[PDB]
Amino acid sequence: YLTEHPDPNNENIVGYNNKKCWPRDARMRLMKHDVNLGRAVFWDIKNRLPRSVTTV
Amino acid sequence: TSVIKIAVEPVNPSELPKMLDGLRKVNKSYPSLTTKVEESGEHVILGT
Amino acid sequence: DHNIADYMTAKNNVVINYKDMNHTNSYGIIRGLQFASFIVQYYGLVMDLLVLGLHR
Amino acid sequence: GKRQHQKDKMYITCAEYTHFYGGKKPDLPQTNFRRLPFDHCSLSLQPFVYP
Amino acid sequence: EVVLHEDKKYYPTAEEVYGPEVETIVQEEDTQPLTEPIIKPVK
Amino acid sequence: FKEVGIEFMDLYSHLVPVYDVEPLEKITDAYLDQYLWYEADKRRLFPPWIKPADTE
Amino acid sequence: RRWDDDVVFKNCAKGVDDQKKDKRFVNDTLRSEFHKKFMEKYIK
Amino acid sequence: NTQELLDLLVKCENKIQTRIKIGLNSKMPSRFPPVVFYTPKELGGLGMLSMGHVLI
Amino acid sequence: TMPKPQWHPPWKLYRVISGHLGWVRCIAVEPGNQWFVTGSADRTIKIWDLASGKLKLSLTGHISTVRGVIVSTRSPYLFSCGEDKQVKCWDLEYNKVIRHYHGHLSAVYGLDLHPTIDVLVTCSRDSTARIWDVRTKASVHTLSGHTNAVATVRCQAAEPQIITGSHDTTIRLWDLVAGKTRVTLTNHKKSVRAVVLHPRHYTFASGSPDNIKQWKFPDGSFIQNLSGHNAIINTLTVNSDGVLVSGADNGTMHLWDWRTGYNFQRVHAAVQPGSLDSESGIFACAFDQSESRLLTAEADKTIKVYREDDTATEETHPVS
Amino acid sequence: SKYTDLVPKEVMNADDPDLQRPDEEAIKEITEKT
Amino acid sequence: FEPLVRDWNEFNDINKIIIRQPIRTEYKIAFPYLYNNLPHHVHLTWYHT
Amino acid sequence: MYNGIGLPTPRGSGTNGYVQRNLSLV
Amino acid sequence: TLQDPTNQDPSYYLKNTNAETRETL
Amino acid sequence: IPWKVPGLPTPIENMILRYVKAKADWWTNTAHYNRERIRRGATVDKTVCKKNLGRLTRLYLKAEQERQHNYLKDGPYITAEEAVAVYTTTVHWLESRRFSPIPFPPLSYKH
């Protein structure tokens, strides 16, 4: 993922969206490893699916 | 002795230098006021 | 049976009309048909086989 | 005059224009704290073994 | 190539129609809040 | 086939398309819908990850 | 023998790489970016 | 477990009762004691089910 | 036939600004060259930065098309009129509407401030003009006499103090204190939509689809007929160096020499990407206070900025 | 009312001062009057 | 009256707090600049006579 | 809003906004 | 300082082509 | 519905296309912010909800009718390769699960 989408300024925390319904102890902690793991999983699943049939 | 200890922090983090400017000014103006910076970056005031 | 398949696919190809405007549907499905739910589930099955593998 | 319908007015209200139609958003915090722990490799983002 | 319906562009670009010597500004959002005055009084 | 009419159900936060099909055709579609689901359930077309299932 | 061996498609999210929709200002309002986002939000 | 809902339910129960009082051209609370709302339809009341008389 | 006209360099487009969502109908520059203000059919008033071309602020009080804006020189106010029959005073210390004027019967088409006295003059589609006390919001006078919609209105210290051109193709020169017409000028054949007053020449020009006519104060004595712009002209703007700009309804500008009536440049600008070729048109233009840049508010919803061309000489572009 | 006042008047700079606007004292006096 | 004014952080964290006495509202009225983040339009009260 | 508890305004809530302390704390 | 807190082809898109797909294309 | 008037002079037609485009912008922007007010709860009037629903329907059908036209002109979006891969994959799935295909219902069908 970081090969295809290099991020020098570490802005990946900005787009990521988490549940504001829970308290701060209960929300997702937006740690560097976990934010990039989540984006990499999503990107891999998104590459599975041709844009002409559907997308995520 | 100054033993009462209060920690301050700007609301906009980008506004941090102005606060530091302000801190030096209160340090000149109150004779026994102490200002420290901790390891974790808190700015601390000691007063009575 | 190919007769039923022709009936379902041909049934999606209709003129849609609200008030003075009308056009032919030729691309997507019309979700308000009675058997549309079947189509979605069956077509969704194909998308599942893309996201998984055949093996998984 | 009575300000009877103030949310639904004959124009776009000031707060509504700010929040939806291109007014200036306050935009307070930007990447306030994003530091990898010291024990982690910068490339892998996982605990190093040979630093 | 083949361009999807949400991808497709109908009109040419602004710097295609005006040229290189013309600078195009698109302002969708403004840079001040309403709270900040245009003519600020001296304090 | 005949043309279908379209309206929108206003749910105040979004709009939902509502399709109006002729009655004769609608009886034929409803019969096909029941038949297809019965035979597909008997022949095990849809694998169990496909929800909503009848059982729960 | 990676876990994505028998996966039918690859590279399908290579086009959407960069978002620059803002700088393009179209005068036609049904073709504008705002209206396309509007119609995507509210007819769902 | 959702406090937002409990606030919303108290508001909504009061709006329904107030609309019935508006229909009668009066909002004075003693002409409309809760017996007229909560009493079941089998005794002549409106019979509304309650959720908003809780402590939040 | 005439003397040799003065040489003026050509102007070229250098900046296109695009942020409104309807026709830009009016434009005005602050007295200190820092910002200009445009009003739109969008119903928003936008304050832009004159140097960078950036949007500073938007103000949204109006109910219909904002048809004219002007900035006060002696107070921090912005005055706007609109097709919703309403004239507003905006306080730029607060960015708030602080007062409004009532009594107009139809759409207000333009407005101007008297340069010494604190009155506001607005012209309207009910074929009247009105003189308003700025403070106490009272009509001191209604100038009446035109038989169709008054399209433009201008003010000066010298007599006559108010000039109004109208859709009944006449110009009227008014006594401000009595509120009566002094002079009526009926030389045009089609409706007079734009009038401009020279900065120091004690003359004025008026425009109609026929041709521009140039007249002499105080009595309205006809001087000259400036001909060639065969289009409905919406605005006249005069420079201090003697440049006259005529912006048409089909999108063409003609630059003219005020002295001799010589037409030295014709400009027709492209429209923005989305629009139709019929969407080109110019509703207003204004020089800044530096007079270096020319701002035109247009019907393809853009603001175009023209700059005088420094590389060109008399040898390159001769005066014919 | 006549014909001679619609023909184009002389087009040249015969008199720079005659077209010039009045001085500041006169405009201040008329401003105060009005 | 009606109100006049109408993120994850380290400065506000609960593991660092020594809850000895609660901070009442009276204290925030009494020393408003000490116990409030954002005191706008606040008046200092007479201390003692 | 005393001690950081309660509605800043009771208006439009549908209730009078009376707040009491929990008596079943341990 | 290691740490200071104060600072194309048609058969593109098409991995794993099976026998019937190769033969058909 | 496409509007053409064959005789009509082109100054008049340019003026008409100008003012129809202006009214279209006024109409569509009003649709845009009354929907926001309806969603946030700011309006309580039912006739404005009916008018917005009407305006919204017309805008949706203008867009959808364009989408169908582009589908026929700009080609199918599913390529021959992607279509054959989808089809062949489904065949292998159904073949491995040993699915017997549904027949046409006979008229002497017991159910």
* Interface-testing mutation among I58, I234, I249, I278, with chain N (most N C-beta atoms within 10 A): I278
Find chains touching chain G: ≥3 CB pairs under 8 Å: A, C, E, F, I, M, N
I143, β-bridge pairs: I129
Q: Which two tokens stand for residue D39?
A: 């024990």
Residues in chain I: 320
* B7/B19 Cα distance (integer angstroms): 12
The 8-class DSSP code of residue B15 comes to G
The chain M residue lying nearest B37, using CA atoms, is: M6
What are the beta bridge partners of residue C24?
Answer: C15
Question: How do strand I77-82 and strand I66-71 relate by DSSP bridges?
Answer: antiparallel
Spatial contact of I176 and I162, defined as CB atoms under 8 Å apart = yes
Say how many CA atoms lie within 13 Å of I58 toward its Cβ: 29
CB atoms within 10 A of CB N67: 15
CB N62 within 8 A of CB G31: no
- Residue I256 CB partners (closer than 8 Å, separation 6+): I212, I226, I243, I244, I245, I246, I262, I263, I264
**Cα dist from N100 to F31, N96, N103, whole Å:** 21, 11, 9
What's the reported resolution, in angstroms, to a tenth?
2.9
| Structural gaps in chain G: residues followed by a C–N separation over 2.5 Å | none
Q: Are strands C15-18 and F4-10 parallel, antiparallel or unpaired?
A: parallel
The partner residues of B35 in beta bridges, in order of sequence, read B45
D48 at I interface, C-beta within 8 A: no
**Which long-range contacts does F29-34 make (Cβ < 8 Å, 24+ apart)?**
F29/C11, F29/C33, F29/C34, F29/C35, F30/C34, F32/C4, F32/C7, F32/C8, F32/C34, F32/C35, F33/C34, F33/C35, F33/C37, F33/C38
Verify H-N touch: 3 or more CB pairs within 8 A: no
Q: Are I264 and I257 in contact (CB under 8 A)?
A: yes
CA end-to-end span of chain F, whole Å? 37
Q: How far is N89 from chain M (nearest CA, A)?
A: 9
**What CA dihedral angle connects I87, I93, I95 and I99, to 10 degrees?**
-30
Q: Is D34 on the interface with M (CB under 8 A)?
A: no
Residues of chain K in contact with residue L2, where contact means CB-CB under 8 angstroms, are 25
SS3 C5: helix
Taking a C-beta distance cutoff of 8 angstroms, is the pair I124, I100 a contact? no
In degrees and rounded to multiples of 5, residue A5 shows phi and psi of: -125, 75
Peptide bond into I318 cis (omega under 30): no
In 10 A of CB E26, how many CB atoms?
Answer: 14
The HSE-up count of residue I289 (CA atoms within 13 Å, CB side) is: 13
Q: Using CB atoms, which chains have 3+ pairs under 8 A with A?
A: C, D, G, K, N
Pairwise CA distance, residues H14 & H24, whole Å? 16
What is the CA angle A45-A48-A53, rounded to 5? 115
- CA dist list (Å): H44 to E37, H37, H40, H52, M18: 62, 10, 7, 22, 74
Q: Give the residue from chain D lying closest to E33, CA to CA.
A: D24
Closest residue on chain F to G43 (Cα): F15
CB contact, 8 Å: N88 with chain M? yes
Structure tokens at E24: 């195009």
For residue G16, the 8-state DSSP code is G
L13 Cβ partners below 8 Å, 6+ apart? H7, H10, H11, L7
Q: Please give the structure tokens belonging to residue E18.
A: 């005006």
Q: Which chains touch M (3 or more CB pairs under 8 A)?
A: B, D, G, N
Q: Which residues of E touch D24 (CB under 8 A)?
A: 29-33
Residue bearing tokens 């008596």 = L23
Those residues with Cβ within 8 angstroms of residue I132's Cβ, 6 or more apart along the chain or in another chain: I87, I101, I119, I120, I121, I122, I138, I139, I140
Contact H8, N41 (CB under 8 A): no
Q: What phi, psi does I123 have (nearest 5°)? A: -120, 145
- How far is C-alpha I191 from the chain's CA centre? 16
Which is it for the CA torsion E22, E23, E27, E31, positive or negative? negative
CA–CA distance, I307 with I312 (Å, rounded to integer): 13
Closest CA to I150 of I222, I77, I81: I81
Elucidation technique: cryo-EM
CB E26 within 8 A of CB G25: yes
Chain N residues touching G34 at Cβ < 8 A? 32
Angle between helix axes C36-51 and N80-96 (nearest 10 degrees) is: 100
Cβ proximity of I285 and I27 under 8 Å = yes
Cβ separation of B40 and M6 shorter than 8 Å? no
Q: Do C38 and F2 touch (CB under 8 A)?
A: no
Using an 8 Å CB-CB cutoff, list residues of chain D that contact chain E.
Answer: 14, 18, 22-24, 26
Residue I112 host element (H or E) = strand I108-113
User: What are the φ and ψ backbone dihedral angles of N85, each rounded to 5 degrees?
Assistant: -70, -40
Strand ranges (DSSP E) for chain N? none
Query: What are the tokens at I76?
Result: 């921090």
Closest by CA to I165, choosing from I194, I205, I199, is: I194
Is B6 in Cβ contact with K34 (below 8 Å)? yes
Chain centroid offset of residue I255 CA: 15
CA dist C25 to A29, I221, K42, N57, Å?
A: 47, 70, 65, 16
Give the pairing type, strands I66-71 and I55-59.
unpaired
Residues from chain C that touch N93, judged by Cβ atoms under 8 A, are 49, 54
Per the CB < 8 A criterion, the answer to whether B43 and B8 are in contact is yes
Would you give the DSSP letter of residue B16? H
Taking CA–CA distances from M6, the nearest residue in chain B reads B41
> Which residues of chain K are within 8 Å of residue D33 when distances are taken between CB atoms?
10
Size of chain M, expressed as the number of residues it contains: 25
Phi, psi at I267, each rounded to 5°? -125, 130
Beta bridge partners of L25: none
Lookup: tokens for I250: 């089909």
Q: With an 8 Å Cβ cutoff, is D3 touching chain A?
A: no
- Considering only CB atoms, C33 lies closest to which of F6, F29, F49, namely F29
Rounded Cα gap, residues L7 and L21, in angstroms: 15
Edge-first strand listing for the sheet containing B34-37: B4-8, B43-47, B34-37
| C-beta of residue I226 within 8 angstroms of C-beta of residue I205 | yes
Cα dihedral I311/I312/I313/I315 (nearest 10): 130
CA distance L19 to I265: 78
- N67/F contact by beta carbon, under 8 A: no
Residue I15 phi/psi, 5° resolution?
-150, 130
Length of chain G measured in residues: 44
| Calpha distance F4→F20 (Å, rounded) | 5
CB contacts under 8 A, E 1-40 vs I, are: 11-14, 17-18, 21-32, 34, 37-40
3-state SS track over chain J: CCCCCCCCCCCCCCCHHHHCCCCHHHHHHHHHHC
Report whether the peptide linkage leading into residue F52 is cis, meaning its omega lies within 30 degrees of zero.
yes
Contacts 24+ apart (CB under 8 A), N23-29: N24/G29, N25/G29, N25/I21, N25/I22, N25/I41, N26/I22, N26/I41, N27/N55, N28/G29, N28/G30, N28/G35, N28/N59, N29/G29, N29/I21, N29/I42
Residue E32: count of CB within 10 angstroms of its CB: 17
Q: Tokens 């001690």 sit at which residue? A: L3
CB within 8 Å: I41 and N25:
yes
D38 to chain M, any CB pair closer than 8 A? The answer is yes
Six-digit token string for B24: 């030096």
Is the CB of residue I280 less than 8 Å from the CB of residue I299?
Answer: yes
Which two three-digit tokens encode residue H20? 């019935």
Tell me, yes or no, whether chains J and E touch by having 3 or more C-beta pairs under 8 A. Answer: no
Name the residue among G38, K4, D12 with its Cα closest to residue N42.
D12
Q: How far apart are CA I88 and CA I80, in angstroms?
A: 5
I278 interaction partners in chain N (CB closer than 8 Å) = 13-15, 17-18
Distance from chain centroid for Cα J8: 17
Distance of CA C52 to the CA centre of its chain: 22
Pair of tokens at residue I42: 């969008």
Report the alpha-carbon distance of residue D7 to residue A54 in Å, rounded.
Answer: 39
* Residue closest to D12 by CA, chosen among N33, B23, L11: N33
Residue (of G24, I281, I64) closest to N26 by Cα position? I64
DSSP secondary structure of N31-51: HHHHHHHHHHT----HHHHHH
Give the helix ranges, DSSP H, for chain D.
14-20
Q: CB contacts < 8 Å between I and N, how many?
A: 22
L24 touches chain H (CB under 8 A): no
Q: What is the DSSP string of I175-223?
A: -TTT--EEEEE---SS---EEEE-SSSSEEEEE-SS-EEEEETTTTEEE
Q: Is G8 exposed, middle or buried (0-12, 13-18, 19+ CB in 10 A)?
A: buried
Contact H14, L11 (CB under 8 A): no
Two tokens, residue H52: 């908003």
Q: What is the CA radius of gyration of chain B?
A: 11
Burial K1-40 (b: 16+ CB within 10 A, else e): eeeeeeeeeeeeeeeeeeeeeeeeeeebeeeeeeeeeeee
Residue appearing with tokens 């195009």: E24
Cα(K15)–Cα(K12) distance, rounded to whole angstroms?
A: 9
- CA–CA distance, B10 with B20 (Å, rounded to integer): 10
Extract the tokens encoding J12. 């040249």
- CA–CA distance, L19 with I34 (Å, rounded to integer): 55
